[PDB]
């Protein structure tokens, strides 16, 4: 129950990421619940101000949380943001780790759009995973948001749109379960890698798990390499067996993209939209979790 800025009241922790913690808050002046990220000012490597800059750069985008205030109060750097709802991982667990094809396709449509939006602002996300997509609350309850720009980086110059150079010999950045094959090989991430990751997320929602989950290793680095080997040895047609061909076509498309290629986001959305229509589904935003009694 601390005052933050002029008009924000801090409540209980709702989340922790790589740095700081996320608290329920109230905007006392507006009568609105918010999320408040705190980062201890005495950290050697401050990151919250950089994250707030990236969120500010993303403002106006559908499914980008609004940043309401940034500052520093007592022991903390402070970022106040729109309060969002549960993650897609949370909702997956709530739905007994089964999504209907309709729900997967409703999500795919928005998630491709969110990634395209981030790319349009000269960034790649590099941490595409079900934990980093949150449904909105209230009037925004049908909207998928993307969060966690802790690994986000410019893939091109904001002036010239000059693409970052090709590099190899990288250590893995991001989440091993959903990382692109290029990422596992130590190649620089680009737009294609966020989309390939989304393709693994979509097949994750379809299957309940990916075939490279639960691989035993002595060390993290060895585990990344076992996941790498399993991904590279699992044909897309085997990963996607018993599911609509569109999931395989999507992953084949992303795996074919050149390092500096602009993805055809419209093609990828239309792939799922055509499937959605062939199934006779409506874009009515009735997700599986909306049916929980």
């Amino acid at each position: 129950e601390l005052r933050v800025g002029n008009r924000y009241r801090l409540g209980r922790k709702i989340g922790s990421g790589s740095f700081g913690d996320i608290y329920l808050g109230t905007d006392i002046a507006a009568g609105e619940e918010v999320a408040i990220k705190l980062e201890c000012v005495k950290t050697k490597h401050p990151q919250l101000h950089i994250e707030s800059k990236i969120y500010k750069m993303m403002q106006g985008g559908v499914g980008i949380p609004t940043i309401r205030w940034c500052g520093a109060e007592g022991d903390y750097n402070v970022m106040v943001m729109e309060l969002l709802g549960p993650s897609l991982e949370d909702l997956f667990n709530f739905c007994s780790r089964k999504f209907s094809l309709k729900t997967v396709l409703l999500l795919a449509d928005q998630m491709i759009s969110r990634i395209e939006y981030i790319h349009s602002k000269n960034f790649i996300h590099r941490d595409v995973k079900p934990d980093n997509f949150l449904m909105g609350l209230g009037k925004k309850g049908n909207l998928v948001y993307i969060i966690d720009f802790g690994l986000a980086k410019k893939y091109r110059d904001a002036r010239t749109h000059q693409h970052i150079p090709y590099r190899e010999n990288k250590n893995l950045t991001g989440t091993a379960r959903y990382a692109s094959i290029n990422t596992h090989l130590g190649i620089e991430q680009s737009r294609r890698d966020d989309l390939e990751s989304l393709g693994y997320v979509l097949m994750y929602f379809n299957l309940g798990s990916l075939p490279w989950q639960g691989l035993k290793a002595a060390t993290k680095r060895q585990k990344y390499e076992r996941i790498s080997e399993k991904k590279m040895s699992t044909p897309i047609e085997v990963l996607c067996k018993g599911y609509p061909s569109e999931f395989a076509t999507y992953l084949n498309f992303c795996r074919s993209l050149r390092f500096d290629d602009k993805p055809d986001y419209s093609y990828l959305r239309q792939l799922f939209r055509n499937l959605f229509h062939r199934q006779g589904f409506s874009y009515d935003y009735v997700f599986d979790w909306n049916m929980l009694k």
């Binding site: 790589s18 941490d127 250590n171």
Partner: peptide, 10 residues
């Protein structure tokens, strides 16, 4: 498991 689901890097 944390090793496969925890993001790494900065």
């Amino acid at each position: 498991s944390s090793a496969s689901t925890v993001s790494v890097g900065s």
